């Protein structure tokens, strides 16, 4: 039975002169042991291919919204896929979510990462509003 | 071999929404009988693991639609994934969730009259057990 | 251990006369030999049920978009899913990756496509937001 992990939002951070905000992660589902959650990153324990999925809720008012996920390992930081949406002026209008996923080789060691590349971003916490997951393949 | 379910709409519902437009779903690819569709909800008797994903394309221009996944077991309603939106705009979510025996999914938009495409390849419903 | 495949493009082609936008992919991950990327099309050697996925990143501003995944085999064409935005008023607002995927019974013979059904419409190469992939089930 294969491994998998989905994760909903703890809290939001933004360190000071950053511009980058980012989610602290509470696993909600777990099978296996390939997977674990520490705080705002994700460890990769079992090496594999790896269903990976993302959706953020976006409440800001700016231009666009989209999250990052990359893999951070082997010295380097990759990008697997982004997300990108436009966004009302309008801010009683601003909720919009956000949902990327792809098929990745991932390795033990392997840091996964969720990044909103604006400080102090206006996501939400609800559950099945934001979250990330991943099903080993 | 994983059980699968995908299932794309017949038709909508009724007058008074309750503030829900809802669809009638027809399974068109189907692997086990662990997966029912019964109408606007989809019936599961194999507890597991499942991916879960829902698309809607909407034809309307209001406040914001988007569709709400949910299911509701024994005793309590609990919502799995939301889709959230802001004249042809398609709205897709999934995720991973361990549903029960029993179970009833919905798929609802939380809006009276919400005008839906009924195109198989705009707007559909499916499951894989993992 | 499931089959996998998961392509970035390489190319944009478009026909003068057609209406229609091509991509071609090449694989950066692969797994089993069940699918095979030729020029601007998957072909499916291994009959089976497939996740299928897909997402395309907009360059283009003032245009409704999205595109369109389909299958050719047994004499005719068939739609498995688009994605579609109404990406228009403001120009300043205009990027959008368009994501969809579902699963589906594909034959030995038949060949995948993902279409833009407007003439030169300008997309992002980006391998990070424009994408295709498939697991078998």
Not at 10 to 26: P, Y
Not at 101 to 117: C, E
């Amino acid at each position: 039975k294969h491994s998998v992990l989905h994760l909903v939002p703890v809290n939001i951070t933004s360190k000071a002169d950053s511009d980058v905000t980012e989610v602290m992660w509470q696993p909600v589902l777990r099978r296996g042991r390939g997977l674990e959650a520490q705080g705002d990153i994700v460890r990769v324990w079992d090496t594999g291919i790896y269903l990976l999925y993302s959706q953020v809720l976006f409440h800001d008012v700016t231009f666009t919204m989209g999250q990052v996920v990359s893999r951070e390992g082997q010295g380097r930081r990759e990008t697997l896929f982004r997300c990108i949406r436009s966004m009302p002026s309008d801010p009683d209008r601003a909720y919009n979510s956000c949902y990327s996923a792809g098929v990745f080789h991932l390795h033990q060691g392997d840091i996964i990462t969720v990044k909103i590349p604006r400080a102090n971003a206006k996501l939400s916490l609800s559950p099945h509003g934001t979250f990330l997951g991943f099903v080993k393949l």
